[PDB]
Design a protein around this nucleic acid. Structure first.
Lengths: 206, 263, 158
RNA sequence: UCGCUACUACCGAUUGGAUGGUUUAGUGAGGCCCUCGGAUCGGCCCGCCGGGGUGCCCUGGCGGAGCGCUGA
RNA sequence: GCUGCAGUUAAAAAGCUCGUAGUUGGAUCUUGUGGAGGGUUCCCCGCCCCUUGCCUCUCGGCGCCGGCCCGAAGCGUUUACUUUGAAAAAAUUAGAGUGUUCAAAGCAGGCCCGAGCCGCCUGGAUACCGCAGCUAGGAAUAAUGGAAUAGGACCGCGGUUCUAUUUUGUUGG
RNA sequence: UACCUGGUUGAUCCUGCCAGUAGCAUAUGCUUGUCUCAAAGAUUAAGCCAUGCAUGUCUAAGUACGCACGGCCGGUACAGUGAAACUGCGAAUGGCUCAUUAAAUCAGUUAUGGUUCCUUUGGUCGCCUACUUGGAUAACUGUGGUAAUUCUAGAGCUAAUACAUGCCGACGGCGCUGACUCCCUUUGUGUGGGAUGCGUGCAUUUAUCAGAUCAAAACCAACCCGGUCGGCGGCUUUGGUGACUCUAGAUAACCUCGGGCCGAUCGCAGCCCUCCGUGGCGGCGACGACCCAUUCGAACGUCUGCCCUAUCAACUUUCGAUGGUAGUCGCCGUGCCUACCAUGGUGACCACGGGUGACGGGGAAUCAGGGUUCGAUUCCGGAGAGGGAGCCUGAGAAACGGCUACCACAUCCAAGGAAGGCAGCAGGCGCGCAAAUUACCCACUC
């Protein structure tokens, strides 16, 4: 119906070619996923040669990663901020490859606190002392220090990172096609990208 | 016509090395899918009534194959058509006969009878090396056998002897200059001669010179060469003719010399 | 180099990561970027200029994804007026067997040009090679540029 | 030149007629996708009986309640 | 009417000139001698300076007595042309074989034995395939190429800068 | 066989055309003994169609309580033969037509390192239920409706390699945590063992790491061996291509259920029991399933090749034209599509436009040499089934011997409705100068 033909469209000279063969099943469209954020709705689509293709509508979880220290945990996908293909897609909260979105930022802290033995940015130390100090202080004899010594000075954590934990959000990059895969996935922004997209955000809105 | 795959091949579309006539009807057998390619096959039924003449109609072959007197590559087959090609062994155990499919210098599949002892193995070219899962290797051959754990110095364009009984190759030949080779396709076909020289081009369609024991030099593409044994010493039995590739004048001279068309 | 972004998106090479390990360079140092390149094979050589320089382009074969496989051809420059591509020409001779004469015919083709080459001028010989499609009228990329023909680009004293 | 017959082409009022294809705008069948919709049909919990077991349990048969929760 | 036409008078050179595309374009850059194949000088190795132009070498063979020699590796500024290979569906066509009763065809068929051989022998060639593309040899012919506001040659030296990761058994400064 | 002859004048020599001459293929007239081979509604109307037929299918081996036949008596998987019905598979092959179609089709040449692939062939096959789980449908039995259809309702039964579920065996698997404990330097750090936790097959998606060897020395810090109570000599680790972000490996995770895999299936014939029908196991098949390879292909892409026309010379663009960047979609590559941005692309070497009684090629007729003309048509490729569009099923179709709608036709009707597409074989009407039997048969060839 809606098709992805190539026997339409002008040649280089501005010429036209007269109608040749009728539309066929291997040149075919099928309308866009237009996936949002919400409760999971998945549809299974039969596709050529078999080998079913998953189309995801309204995901709310993706597997992001923090490849700086190589941990990857499942985290909720809150809202869109920047979509580098169009401005309109952000307004209706459409989710596609290479967007910039927000997450809860929760397990990354839990991992950091247990492994590097330090909290991130904090409102107050009063919260920590009755519980959440129980993990941070430890009763080991022998391997209070012995393990943790090797973790020291490999946890400088950068300025633009640390400030974001306090808000409870982090900026990560969709590196999947949700409409073809059936899953959202990605990597979290680091380095110069994370400097770049801040400037685009503050430029465009506000 | 086409919307999917075809299931007919006519008489006149079919290759000329099956030596078909033109006064039986429009269709020809067409080999069904298998390890060999249809411009290199000899379909089974063409061996049984257009060569050896046991059968006379296609319905007779259907009554023969069901009885399970036929084998191919030491296993039992039971259909009108099977796509056996170069270097396979047919085995009828009731008559005590064994055949081999190999090329005349004319370039067509002949009758090359052999001892049953010879018919316990065949010679197979290596074409591709492919590392499988968890650090295990594979071979790929033209008869489409995947033989795991080969020796780690065997590479493509070599040939390997396979025991039909147990698989799992016992020995091999290494591709080297001065080893004896047979041709399997192209304009030169059925010629036997040593390698002599190689030629390489980065890209594709490298060629391979050849010379025989009649003092003639010729060349062919790389991928039409098949190794048969070390220099002037085949590790297989050879038919009459022996890759000489006589001119037409000399062939005339032989026939009028023996005066041979009667016994 | 220090600016290579003008898009609404960030530009970078695949197969590159930014580590956050160690901290001590003093003033400056590693630009926090190792360069990516690869061999092309077939007796063609990567330019020094590619490995030195900084550009992000995915359609050149010295950096980005695209192979050269199949044919290899030549041509000549005729025009450049487009960004990250050029136009070229192929002069050749068509024969007629009723007559015993030839006649001239030419076709024109576009082909993509790397930001690596920037010494191109209109009239240089160019070499190209078959590739997978990049665009509607681009199927090729440059492998090499040369000048080795009459009325050279600069005075003889080289 | 003018007069006589066969015959062919052209111009032409009629703003000719007929048939076919393009083209702006409006209207728009049918299917597909998406978002809703819930006719309707079941399952599992509490009574009585049958079987097994420790007034109660499991399973089967039968009825009724909330039709609670749940699937199609 | 390319091979192969015609234009004073028979049908026919723009009134005349300039002019871009197109087509076409002067001359000029190497010859003799022993061996081998064919004559009585002349047409695969070498020699005058050159001879398939060079090196540089290093890794895997051949040698000869650690030391030394020569095949494969980059190529001779680029093309056309010509010559050799590769790769080309069948039928048709040319064409070999075969007594279809001869032929148009066809791909067959021919042999010795009373059957007592339980068989023997043999064919189903070969050629052609505009182009364009792939391969190797030739260097005449026709295009294209270089140092004249100098850079070619040699481990000739300086000045200046960047970088390679090998070795002091290993791992770090 | 590389050939000419008649006709302008009173007569002659030219120029030039007309006529004569031979072949080929269509029609037509007249005539016609015997023998073999055989083209045949293409030309025009890809006009329209009565009737008949042209695609179905069971083995020892998916499912047999047909009140069928049969039985030697049965059912205790249970018969032998078996209509019907569910299930699997095919119906996308062939046959036919030449309407569309001028860089399109198609041919030669190349490319998947840009992809998909039923099937065959070869490999892949263990991290109050398991002596076998769950509940309905047909045939069948019985009652009906409609003018009419290969229409269809209601009731009562009963199956599975249909449908929906889900163990066990043999896990004595791996890394990182380290309750702890022991020796020597409090610690740190050098040590040896260690309970207790979580993950630990392949496939799927993401991030990260590795994917080694070049050329030599001088001292200092931690250190092996040849060996000693501060210092000398000796080592270093997958596969493949011309070339890949390749192959295989490691780490951290992701998991699709109703929507990855890892057998609750069927048929032949044998055995062994610290031993008496169980607990065990062996051969031969049949079917199914996941992945890899293979075969048959499919789909896009490279270079070169085209008939007539200028009384067609400028064409193409936000109704994407050319390119850049990102995304969507798709089996994949790609302005294929969308957003943003640039202003390009093509042409006197004939673009663009128009015409074609133009499907293309392998070829055919004529022919000294060079050519000219034809190619609907038996082989190969393509396109289409009254005209348009959409879609289901499947590995493969935008299918018409499938479906839905519109438009042009045409049929039946109780006027409520219902049914149809001969460019398949025959046959009829029409059209024309113009073209065959409503025959016989699956024996050959497939």
């Amino acid at each position: 119906g809606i098709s992805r033909d190539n026997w339409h469209k002008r040649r280089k000279t501005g010429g036209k070619r007269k109608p040749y063969h009728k539309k066929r099943k291997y040149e075919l469209g099928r309308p866009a996923a237009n996936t949002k954020i919400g409760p999971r709705r998945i549809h299974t689509v039969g596709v050529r040669g078999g080998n079913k293709k998953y189309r995801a509508l309204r995901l709310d979880v993706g597997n992001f990663s923090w490849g700086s220290e190589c941990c990857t945990r499942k985290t909720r996908i809150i809202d869109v901020v920047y979509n580098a293909s169009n401005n309109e897609l952000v307004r209706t909260k459409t989710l596609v490859k290479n967007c910039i979105v927000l997450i809860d930022s929760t397990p990354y802290r839990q991992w950091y606190e247990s492994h590097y033995a330090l909290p991130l940015g904090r409102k107050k130390g009063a919260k920590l002392t009755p519980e959440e100090e129980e993990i941070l202080n430890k009763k080991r004899s022998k391997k209070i220090q012995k393990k943790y010594d090797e973790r020291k000075k490999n946890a400088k954590i950068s300025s633009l990172l640390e400030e974001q934990f306090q808000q409870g959000k982090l900026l990560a990059c969709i590196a999947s096609r949700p409409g073809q895969c059936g899953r959202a996935d990605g990597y979290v922004l680091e380095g110069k990208e994370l400097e770049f997209y801040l400037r685009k955000i503050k430029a465009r809105k506000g | 016509m086409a919307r999917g795959p075809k299931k007919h091949l006519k008489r006149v579309a079919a290759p000329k090395h099956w030596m078909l006539d033109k006064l039986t009807s429009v269709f020809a057998p067409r080999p069904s899918t298998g390890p060999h390619k249809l411009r290199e096959c000899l379909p089974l039924i063409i061996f049984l009534r257009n060569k050896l003449k046991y059968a006379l109609t296609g319905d007779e072959v259907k009554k023969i194959c069901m009885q399970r007197f036929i084998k191919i590559d030491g296993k039992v087959r039971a259909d009108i058509t099977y796509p056996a090609g170069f270097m396979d062994v047919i085995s009828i155990d009731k008559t005590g006969e064994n055949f081999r499919l190999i090329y005349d210098t004319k370039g067509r599949f002949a009758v090359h009878r052999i001892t049953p002892e010879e018919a316990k193995y065949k010679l197979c070219k290596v074409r591709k090396i492919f590392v499988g899962t968890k650090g295990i290797p594979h071979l790929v051959t033209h008869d489409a056998r995947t033989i795991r754990y080969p020796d780690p110095l065997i590479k493509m364009n070599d040939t390997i002897q396979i025991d039909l009984e147990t698989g799992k190759i016992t020995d091999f030949i290494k591709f080297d200059t001065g080893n004896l080779c047979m041709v399997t396709g192209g304009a030169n076909l059925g010629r036997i001669g040593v390698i002599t020289n190689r030629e390489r081009h980065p890209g594709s369609f490298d060629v391979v010179h050849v010379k025989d024991a009649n003092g003639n030099s010729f060349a062919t593409r790389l991928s039409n060469i098949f190794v048969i044994g070390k220099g002037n010493k085949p590790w297989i039995s050879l038919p009459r003719g022996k890759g000489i590739r006589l001119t037409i004048a000399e062939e005339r001279d032989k026939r009028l010399a023996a005066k041979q068309s009667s016994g | 180099m220090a600016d290579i972004q003008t898009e609404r998106a960030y530009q970078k090479q695949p197969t590159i990561f930014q580590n956050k390990k160690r901290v001590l360079l003093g003033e400056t140092g590693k630009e926090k970027l190792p360069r990516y390149y690869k061999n092309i094979g077939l007796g063609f050589k990567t330019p020094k200029e590619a490995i030195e320089g900084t550009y992000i382009d995915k359609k050149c074969p010295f950096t980005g994804n695209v192979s050269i496989r199949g044919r290899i051809l030549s041509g000549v420059v005729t025009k450049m007026k487009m960004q990250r591509t050029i136009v070229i020409r192929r002069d050749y001779l068509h024969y007629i067997r009723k007559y015993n004469r030839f006649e001239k015919r030419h076709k024109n083709m576009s082909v993509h040009l790397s930001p690596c080459f920037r010494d191109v001028q209109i009239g240089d010989i160019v070499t190209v090679g078959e590739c997978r499609p990049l665009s509607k009228t681009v199927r090729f990329n440059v492998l090499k540029v040369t000048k080795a023909a009459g009325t050279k680009k600069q005075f003889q004293k080289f």
